[PDB]
Design a protein around this ligand. Sequence first.
Ligand SMILES: N[C@@H](CCC(=O)O)C(=O)O
Ligand SMILES: N[C@@H](CCC(=O)O)C(=O)O
Ligand SMILES: [Zn+2]
Ligand SMILES: [Zn+2]
Ligand SMILES: [Zn+2]
Ligand SMILES: [Zn+2]
Lengths: 249, 248
Amino acid sequence: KTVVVTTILESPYVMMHEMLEGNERYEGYCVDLAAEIAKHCGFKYKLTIVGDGKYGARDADTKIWNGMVGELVYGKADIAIAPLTITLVREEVIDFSKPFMSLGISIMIKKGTPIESAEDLSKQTEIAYGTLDSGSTKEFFRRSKIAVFDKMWTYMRSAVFVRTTAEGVARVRKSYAYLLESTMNEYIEQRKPCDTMKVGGNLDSKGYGIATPMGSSLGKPVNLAVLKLSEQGVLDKLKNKWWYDKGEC
Amino acid sequence: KTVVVTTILESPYVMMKKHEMLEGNERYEGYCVDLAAEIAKHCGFKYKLTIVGDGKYGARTKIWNGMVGELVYGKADIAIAPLTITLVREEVIDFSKPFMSLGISIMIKKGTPIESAEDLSKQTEIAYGTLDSGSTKEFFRRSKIAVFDKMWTYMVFVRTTAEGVARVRKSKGKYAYLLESTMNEYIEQRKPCDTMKVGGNLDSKGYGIATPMGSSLGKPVNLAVLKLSEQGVLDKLKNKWWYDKGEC
Ligand SMILES: N[C@@H](CCC(=O)O)C(=O)O
Ligand SMILES: N[C@@H](CCC(=O)O)C(=O)O
Ligand SMILES: [Zn+2]
Ligand SMILES: [Zn+2]
Ligand SMILES: [Zn+2]
Ligand SMILES: [Zn+2]
């Protein structure tokens, strides 16, 4: 039967189309990845953009998951192929593949902003900064016990958050610093109008994983699929294809 | 009931303490020792540490040996060691999210005129090899990359990493050792400080906590690994066993 694949519109992972029908509406890293995984695992699939346009978090009172994690937990989709960050709270409710891409939280600034590091952000007030409202980065700052980061969190929760990455980029370009993951950051660094740059090293190191509902029969297949693709050099080729082979700066 | 943890004597992951007077898991110190203790603490089980019988990591008479074998054939309940996550291993056992990153790298005696793998593949005066049962040797065996099929075609193997290191140190630069960057970088800061890593890594892969396929332990050890990483325990531990003990 057709596997329902949940995913999110996020460049260059999944991108737009009005005249097309199907998965063919979309292009990108996770699109090609979906196709390869499907090729090696031998199933048919339908790509579907996560309903609330979010990655996934749990509301602390209502205790319900949103975003792609929610659509996995509540049986609305059979698999998530996306820049979905492997985190503890998520592993608590769903299954993750071995990571298929490395990344870390990093700072994006408008070219010319006098910022060198996260500590620089934590020591000042003139430049605002925030993260994605539902997502692993915000959870990182919320739960962080590091002085600089607890300080930044203390600022942020009381101040700066955006609903989508595009809103964060737009907010930076029209200003404000944006805290976002290095992969998406570096991708935008090579995008017109070429007015943003990454500053400082990454704040942490984690990975993107393929996600299935906890206990799904697909976990092993998608997991040997990811490992196969990695060892065959397919993943490096895909990143090269969508990041650097299309750099506009 | 007691969980049997299979592991391998490999510095700084699992080592004999300065042990004859001791009994138990207390016989050992090292990265994977601390890691095991934390994993057990967060998963709430008791465990007995056991050194893999044939001292091997795992390869496939079609029978698995080493820690992979001891998992497949029910000799241990979990492997906590520098055991590399690979496709062929995933085919037969389960792996946690990786708790450490690493890549294949070249170890040479200080003064050897070698910069990269291509240089090794292009010459004959300096011999080179890998661990006999292990993921590196498999990497070269299965590599479809020209240089690496060339090196494999050439390839000199050792039974333990210590034999490879000793071979490097006693070969007067006529032998290079192909081994994982973590272990390389570790030996790099160890007396007699006569070895160095050359070139970048040949690949990028990981070490994982392993369980027999379908074990109820996979999930627990996997949330434990994710917690430990996120709480900074892993970075602290690597700092502890690698760099806080650097002799150069
Ligand atoms: N990849 C993140 C979303 C992006 C971000 O938070 O910066 C997640 O899985 O939650
Ligand atoms: N970590 C490797 C052994 C060391 C090596 O092959 O260099 C493995 O799990 O097979
Ligand atoms: Zn449209
Ligand atoms: Zn393929
Ligand atoms: Zn001893
Ligand atoms: Zn602890």
